[PDB]
């Protein structure tokens, strides 16, 4: 599913991401935009052989199981395919874990490089939430 910007903001809010660990909803929408372009089916292989899945590009080295990442952990206790669903619950639940892990949203390198420090509220401007 490819979400619209406001549609995704609303779904993230419905699943408790708005201001989770102090990150306003715009931060999450911005991260999603640059990670997956709001496509829940996004996959991208990493040089290390792990793969990133879903709207927030969650990595199989630590967070989910894909059966092909040697030496990895599955800390969200979910198959990586569950991160590709049109329902974002699994991605959201796993992202809450990730953002709680010590470095905040800097876990997502694209957030650090493209969202951090910017006017993230633009990502939710105009949306009925
Ligand atoms: Cl957009
Ligand atoms: Cl294995
Ligand atoms: Cl933080
Ligand atoms: Cs919240
Ligand atoms: Cs809030
Ligand atoms: Cs790519
Ligand atoms: Cs790649
Ligand atoms: Cs990647
Ligand atoms: Cs990556
Ligand atoms: Cs990525
Ligand atoms: Cs990632
Ligand atoms: Cs495994
Ligand atoms: Cs494993
Ligand atoms: Cs586990
Ligand atoms: Cs789970
Ligand atoms: Cs940690
Ligand atoms: Cs950490
Ligand atoms: Cs990372
Ligand atoms: Cs800035």
UniProtKB/Swiss-Prot annotation:
Instruction: Identify the tissues in which this protein is expressed.
Output: In the egg white and polymorphonuclear leukocytes.
Q: Name one GO biological process term.
A: defense response to Gram-positive bacterium
Q: Which GO terms describe its cellular component?
A: cytoplasm; endoplasmic reticulum; extracellular space
What does the record give as the active site? 35, 52
What does the UniProt entry say about where the protein is found? Secreted
Q: Does the keyword Signal apply?
A: yes
Q: Which UniProt keywords apply?
A: Allergen, Antimicrobial, Bacteriolytic enzyme, Disulfide bond, Glycosidase, Hydrolase, Secreted, Signal
Q: Note one Pfam family from the annotation.
A: Lys
Keyword Disulfide bond carried by entry: yes
- Binding locations of substrate: 101
The GO molecular function terms of this record are:
beta-N-acetylglucosaminidase activity; identical protein binding; lysozyme activity
Task: Report the superkingdom from the record.
Answer: Eukaryota
Disulfide-bonded cysteines: 6-127, 30-115, 64-80, 76-94
Q: Which residues form the C-type lysozyme domain?
A: 1-129
Name the Gene3D superfamilies on file. 1.10.530.10
Query: Mainly localized where?
Result: secreted
According to its UniProt record, the EC number is 3.2.1.17
Q: Which InterPro entries has this protein been placed in?
A: Glyco_hydro_22 (IPR001916), Glyco_hydro_22_CS (IPR019799), Glyco_hydro_22_lys (IPR000974), Lysozyme-like_dom_sf (IPR023346)
Catalytic reactions on record: Hydrolysis of (1->4)-beta-linkages between N-acetylmuramic acid and N-acetyl-D-glucosamine residues in a peptidoglycan and between N-acetyl-D-glucosamine residues in chitodextrins
According to the record's subunit comment, the protein's assembly and interactions are:
Monomer.
Q: What extra comment accompanies this record?
A: Lysozyme C is capable of both hydrolysis and transglycosylation; it also shows a slight esterase activity. It acts rapidly on both peptide-substituted and unsubstituted peptidoglycan, and slowly on chitin oligosaccharides.
Function recorded in the entry: Lysozymes have primarily a bacteriolytic function; those in tissues and body fluids are associated with the monocyte-macrophage system and enhance the activity of immunoagents. Has bacteriolytic activity against M.luteus.
Q: Which family does it belong to?
A: Belongs to the glycosyl hydrolase 22 family.
- Under which name does UniProt file this protein? Lysozyme C
Organism whose genome encodes this protein: Gallus gallus
Question: Which gene is transcribed and translated to give this protein?
Answer: LYZ
